[PDB]
Amino acid sequence: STTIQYNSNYADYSISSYLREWANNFGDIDQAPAETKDRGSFSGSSTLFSGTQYAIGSSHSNPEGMIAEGDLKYSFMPQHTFHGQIDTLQFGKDLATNAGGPSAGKHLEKIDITFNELDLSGEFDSGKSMTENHQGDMHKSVRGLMKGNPDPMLEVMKAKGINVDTAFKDLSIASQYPD
Ligand code: HEM
Structure with missing residues (x-):
């Protein structure tokens, strides 16, 4: 049932080329300076460590x-x-x-x-x-992604039957966001 929406700027990316680019720029959290580190945050102020986002x-x-x-x-x-x-x-x-x-x-x-x-x-x-x-x-x-490594995510996606080696343009499950 998985589907994907993509900005038109990424029509000629694949899931693999996008997540590699994204992860290489995001970077390995463990290699980051401590004082610029972002561990993420959950919505919902009653619970620090769970939530809908x-x-x-x-x-x-x-x-x-x-x-x-x-x-x-x-x-x-x-x-x-x-x-x-x-x-x-x-x-x-x-x-x-x-x-x-x-x-x-x-x-x-x-x-x-x-x-x-x-x-x-x-x-x-x-x-x-x-x-x-x-x-x-x-x-x-x-x-993996928070450590600048998209391979575990790509493996999961492939195991699900999602094609990660194909332009979003050409992926049947993908459709472009209206600009
Ligand atoms: C509210 C969000 C989060 C906070 C405040 C938080 C905080 C922390 C802190 C203080 C540490 C110990 C210091 C360190 O090793 O860097 C830690 C370690 C770790 N965090 Fe979290 N974290 C958060 C979310 C996540 C998420 C979403 C994941 C996984 C997807 C994750 C995975 C880990 C792992 C694997 C360790 C290392 C445990 C070990 O091997 O000793 N964290 N985190």
Whole structure:
């Protein structure tokens, strides 16, 4: 059921070439200066580590950002596992916070690509170990991206049957945003 909407500027990108470009600019969070690091934030001020939206911008002073929407959960200490389910995933640049400050949620001022009905899931079991819990699709794919590495996400997409080697122009599941 996954579909994709893309800005016309990316009609001649593929999922692979887009996410590589995006991830190379976003950069590896672990390599970032501590004082410019953005670990992301969840909407919904009653809960620091879960919510319907998770937004994260480059820790390397670049404008690249990503927004995930769904039933989003993060276990924080000590297993640091991102789990639940991502229905919609959006990439672009220039993350800005919504009216209301830090847990109001965010938007991208420049939206490049949106994945719809992504069904990107993962489970967390407090009785399992960290290395086991990190095997979930949702965790390893998003964690890869925050580490400037799109390969885990691309592998998930391919395993789903999504073609990542083809121009958005020429992907049956993709349609262009009206300019
Ligand atoms: C509100 C959002 C988040 C906050 C405030 C946060 C905070 C932290 C902090 C303070 C650490 C320990 C220091 C470090 O290793 O850099 C950490 C580690 C880590 N974070 Fe999170 N994080 C967030 C979201 C995420 C997400 C969404 C993921 C995965 C997709 C993630 C994955 C990890 C991993 C794998 C570690 C390392 C655990 C280890 O190997 O010791 N974090 N995070």
